[PDB]
Design an enzyme around this catalytic site. Sequence first.
Site, mmCIF file in Angstrom:
data_model
loop_
_atom_site.group_PDB
_atom_site.id
_atom_site.type_symbol
_atom_site.label_atom_id
_atom_site.label_comp_id
_atom_site.label_asym_id
_atom_site.label_seq_id
_atom_site.Cartn_x
_atom_site.Cartn_y
_atom_site.Cartn_z
ATOM 1 N N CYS A 32 22.531 3.237 46.944
ATOM 2 C CA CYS A 32 21.481 4.286 47.038
ATOM 3 C C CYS A 32 21.753 5.285 48.176
ATOM 4 C CB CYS A 32 20.117 3.690 47.150
ATOM 5 S SG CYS A 32 19.783 2.550 45.749
ATOM 6 N N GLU A 33 21.966 4.797 49.391
ATOM 7 C CA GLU A 33 22.182 5.717 50.484
ATOM 8 C C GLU A 33 23.519 6.462 50.328
ATOM 9 O OE1 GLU A 33 19.659 6.262 52.096
ATOM 10 O OE2 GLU A 33 18.503 4.387 52.120
ATOM 11 N N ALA A 34 24.561 5.767 49.872
ATOM 12 C CA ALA A 34 25.848 6.426 49.596
ATOM 13 C C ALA A 34 25.720 7.525 48.538
ATOM 14 C CB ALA A 34 26.885 5.392 49.168
#
Length: 251
Positions: free
Chosen positions: A160-162
């Site tokens: 998700c953050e990537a």
Amino acid sequence: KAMTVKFTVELDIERLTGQTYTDFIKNLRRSLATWYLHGVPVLPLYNQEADPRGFDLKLTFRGQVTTVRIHRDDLVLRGYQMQGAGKWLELERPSGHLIEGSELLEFGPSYEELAAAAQQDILDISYNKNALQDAVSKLAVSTNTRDRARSLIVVSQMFCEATRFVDIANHFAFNLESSEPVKLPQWMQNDLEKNWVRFSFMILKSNADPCYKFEPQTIYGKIIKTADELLNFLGIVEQHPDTRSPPCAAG
């Protein structure tokens, strides 16, 4: 109203390299897109109220598998499936059950709640290939709250953050096959991850509303003076309904 599953993407972790991880994230951004702003995909959000849209992320390692269900509009993790019986576990917050037949976990998707359940800080967790392998192994079978929460942190960070941030995807790609721990730099937690929602809004409101005033932001100790420069940090942009309000409103 249960979240639908718009699509499924699948990654095997065993042969994973920096390059194939990067390819996967780039493809996932394209799969998530509804429209594009200066080449950067924008997530759905014309749909609202009672149309939770999701997608599934299937992760496999040496015969061990888990599937994670994620919101397509805000990239928030909502639940995951165990391998043995196919039992769904669902994170608190989102609405009745978003996954039919699920068992609710004792925590929500926020990192404050996940870190407390994991009894471990986001910055003290390793995010390399070995950690991802361990995460799918634990999610496949563990009934232990700590193991589940820690593993969900790893999946949230590395997918998700990537997906949300270029520099985060790069960081995890470049360090992926390392035998030693890969930590997340604090600036990526505090300057990027915590500000995705706010930065997405600033960028789309700047594009939409001639009366909106972009305020320079500081990231990694550098001043980011325009919405164009800010957009360069994002891999994909959230679309809050307020960005579609008529422009140049009073005030």
